[PDB]
Amino acid sequence: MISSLWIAKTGLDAQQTNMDVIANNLANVSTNGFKRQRAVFEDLLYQTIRQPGAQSSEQTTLPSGLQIGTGVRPVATERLHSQGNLSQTNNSKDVAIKGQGFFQVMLPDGTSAYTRDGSFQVDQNGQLVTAGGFQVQPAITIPANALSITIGRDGVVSVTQQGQAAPVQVGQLNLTTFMNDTGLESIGENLYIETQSSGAPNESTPGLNGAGLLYQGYVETSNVNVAEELVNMIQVQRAYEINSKAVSTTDQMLQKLTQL
Amino acid sequence: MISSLWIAKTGLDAQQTNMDVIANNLANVSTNGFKRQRAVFEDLLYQTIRQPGAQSSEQTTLPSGLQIGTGVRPVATERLHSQGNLSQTNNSKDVAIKGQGFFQVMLPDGTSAYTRDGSFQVDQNGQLVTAGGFQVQPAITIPANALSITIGRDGVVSVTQQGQAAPVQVGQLNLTTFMNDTGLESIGENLYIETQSSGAPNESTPGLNGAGLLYQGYVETSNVNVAEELVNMIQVQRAYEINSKAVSTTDQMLQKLTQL
Amino acid sequence: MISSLWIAKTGLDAQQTNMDVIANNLANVSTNGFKRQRAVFEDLLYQTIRQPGAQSSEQTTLPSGLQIGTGVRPVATERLHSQGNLSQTNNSKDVAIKGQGFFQVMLPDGTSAYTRDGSFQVDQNGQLVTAGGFQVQPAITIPANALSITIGRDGVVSVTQQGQAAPVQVGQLNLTTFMNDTGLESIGENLYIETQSSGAPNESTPGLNGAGLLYQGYVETSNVNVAEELVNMIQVQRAYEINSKAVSTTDQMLQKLTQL
């Protein structure tokens, strides 16, 4: 209708998207291994009426031409892959990560996923799963008669059989490092998958190739700064205020145009 | 949005970091060998509106030009290395340092760390470690036939055997001094590794070379005096409240500007 | 549009700048050496209609003619250069100043900066810097075997060498005073640079030529009176409410002028 109303409508969309991101970040506190999301905006087309160059006379040049511009297209959303605060959970099946790296997982479809959540489990077969039956990889089988499981900072997992006075080594839990942590696609279930923005996964032992270490009895908390989220909430609410006010102003302009 | 909103957001971040380090410091009260960590801040941009010079006439000078300023960027959370108190544990294997000095430790990964905590122990192979396999330099092996172990205030550790009534020295436990005691970076367990900001660690025997003294049967408590850090908490809490008040004031600001 | 709306616009802008200053002061509590800021306002033009003199008859004079006037232009923001509270940081590497004076610093561009911050640090080459490798003036190098670094109230820095029982004089730490402390142009980083309104810098040893003393082991706190900032913030919230009411009244006047 008016060139102003479309611009204000894009502004409403941008503030709504940013509030969506804030709400998702806010709600996923107390979700282990969650990475705060941050939306990055970017303006669309500038429809030019007079080119910024475009010499008018033989001496004049017309500095700073007239172009109007529209829109606030949300160009991306990054994800902050910083180390989350560890907390002492005192459970032997909670393993957290100190440094870059992801646990690998086999999805039921056969393709591989990745996750930074160590709140593991043992299923009715004794294998190592994660809250959804997702077999960690490479498969780790805990013998039935084990009384404890110890997962060292080197990822070398061993169990203590009854009777035998030895922690028989039951496997090695290795991490995976990507070149672009932010580029991983999130599929829910606190699981990521491979995509060409991430790059080829580099599987490695914890400690080497820049991978992290493993802390048994710790859980990695979501790095959601409540203070920043709340100030963002205030600002987004006020920006939505202002943009709806712009829509209202253009609407009144149009209605007085119509009345004539 | 509004300039004051951005500036107060930076302030809220800064005071949240203050209270975070204060809470971490309370988390380590009565834990021997802990140092009161402190945060050092830094102001960001100053938006110049009128230059403080800006000759406004042939002769007029306009002193104290107008400029606004933003933000409270925290440069660092530095590590205060000050002398703390000593408590009586009455253990010969627990040593406390009085004055300047750091305990040399050969890290299990093969590097060098230092700690102001001397609750050493003896392992199965005789190496002098302290709650985590922290071996000192030079390597000292306690004889297996030892009866009593005594560590002198000068850094000499010795053992006594059956029959012979002579306290033959078995090892030298010398201190390590830093030009900069603060720049050290922790690697956990109160171990701090040599850093480019700490200065060259000079290996010097206790008593001589301007080092401190060794107290046997004593342990160095954390320098976290409850009274001082409670005073800090009260002040920082006031700062946090007033900054949040500025944020809400800018909110009410904008709300009345929009109810316009 | 309407003269009322322009005058009120300037009023809103002035109150906004005042709130910006208050918010910057409020955020910068607990920032070492920070100086409070105060905004000085200044009304704009007075558009005369009947001249205040302007003899009407051959004997009468028309006292107090009619002139309308506009605007509240904020003319300046002075920086209160009063001494802050010293607090016992107990660090051998933090030195505050008692009285007038700034630590000169050589920027990477080479131009002379000045800081009232005593959180000095040492780089990998051993010298004295300030939290970012800003090489203090005059050139000072702490020897590698130095143990304790004392900064005398006279301003001489000396180090405790390896073995030798002498605190060898290793450098001089001398301040700079200006005729116009308020005129220094802040550039962030807790740094002030000379401007043509500050006056030429005068270099002298601490304690002399009017400069202040050096207090080793202390840090100077920002001289921000929190309650004063609170009262200022309440006042500016009221003023902004009032000016928004003025804008609303002018707008309603216009609206039923057009509805006419």
Swiss-Prot record, chains A, B, C:
Protein origin, superkingdom: Bacteria
Signal peptide interval: none
Subcellular location: Bacterial flagellum basal body
Keyword Membrane: no
Pfam families, A to Z: Flg_bb_rod (PF00460), Flg_bbr_C (PF06429), LlgE_F_G_D1 (PF22692)
A single GO BP: bacterial-type flagellum-dependent swarming motility
GO cellular component: bacterial-type flagellum; bacterial-type flagellum basal body, distal rod
InterPro entries: Flag_bb_rod_N, Flagellar_basal_body_rod_CS, Flagellar_FlgE/F/G, Flg_bb/hook_C_dom, FlgE/F/G-like, FlgG_G_neg, LlgE_F_G-like_D1
Keywords, in A-Z order: Bacterial flagellum
S-adenosyl-L-methionine is among the record's keywords: no
PROSITE patterns: FLAGELLA_BB_ROD
NCBIfam families: FlgEFG_subfam (TIGR03506), flgG_G_neg (TIGR02488)
UniProt family annotation: Belongs to the flagella basal body rod proteins family.
Subunit structure of this chain's protein: The basal body constitutes a major portion of the flagellar organelle and consists of four rings (L,P,S, and M) mounted on a central rod. The rod consists of about 26 subunits of FlgG in the distal portion, and FlgB, FlgC and FlgF are thought to build up the proximal portion of the rod with about 6 subunits each.
PANTHER family the record matches: FLAGELLAR BASAL-BODY ROD PROTEIN FLGG, FLAGELLAR PROTEIN
Stated name of the protein: Flagellar basal-body rod protein FlgG
Organism: Salmonella typhimurium (strain LT2 / SGSC1412 / ATCC 700720)
